[PDB]
Amino acid sequence: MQDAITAVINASDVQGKYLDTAAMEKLKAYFATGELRVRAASVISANAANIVKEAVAKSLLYSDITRPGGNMYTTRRYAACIRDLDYYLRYATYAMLAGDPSILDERVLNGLKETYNSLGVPIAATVQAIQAMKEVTASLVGADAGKEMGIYFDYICSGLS
Amino acid sequence: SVVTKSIVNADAEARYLSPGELDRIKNFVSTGERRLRIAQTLTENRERIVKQAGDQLFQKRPDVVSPGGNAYGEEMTATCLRDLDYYLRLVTYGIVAGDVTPIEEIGLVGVREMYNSLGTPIPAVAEGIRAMKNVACSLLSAEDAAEAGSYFDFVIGAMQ
């Protein structure tokens, strides 16, 4: 999982040169956004269950998906779906802290389309529910973090589609 | 970075970053300005650090610069000094990152295998980094030098 700092030092390392002043400028920028990123991560961690509960209620509950034959019907499948929403929230939060979508690419989105298509999971509905999580999360952490949590949530949706 | 090392060890247990880890990142980002200064000073003095430390290493362990050692002749001796420069650079990356992760992945994993297959005394390499640590102590303020000394210590710890 490359973060902003690890990515900057890696790029400088590939060139071989010691850390440049311009690279220091980029690192200073990430350090500046550190306060909002850490604060938002703490908020998400505490309210994680409520984020998912609100998103499931807004998008998935009382639809065909949650009624017989809909792929969220069986108690097994319902628990699995909420677990997946927790996955997306947790790794989006990791991505926000890092400032880098590499963790999403490497761990979350690799073969996600193939696993879901093999299992029979509706990828359209998963995209819609991730959007509901994006909206709830944006409300909880405010426009500053919601803008960034938005880019990482939308990264997931773009790949998952 | 300290951020990724926290995330990685939390991902293993499948938890959101726990409050202590979040506090650690908070402190690290706040003192990042100090860290960048420390790396700036070492970067600026890199030529002197390498030159002085190389002379000290060769003096303490003359066998490496004697015939039949890895660094005999100006060609091989220059490459040895470059390796010392490499490890100074990796230590600067470590200071800025706040963790030993850049040091570990770039240049502490497989060191035994690489240097053994190059015909180089790894304990001598460790002493060279020790010499660089002393030079760095001279060029850094006491509180900063203690922190940078930790990264030098990690390099020598894996080396020997």
């Binding site: 097994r76 628990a79 699995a80 677990r83 927790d86 996955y87 | 293993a12 247990e13 499948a14």
Partner: peptide, 29 residues
């Protein structure tokens, strides 16, 4: 069961798969 997955429920390694998975043979004496 997907609730019991080492990625998400790392502790519950050893909770039997059950009727949803393979048979688990254990030696008793």
């Amino acid at each position: 069961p997907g609730i019991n997955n080492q990625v998400s429920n790392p502790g519950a390694r050893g909770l039997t798969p059950g009727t949803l998975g393979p048979k688990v043979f254990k030696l008793d004496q």
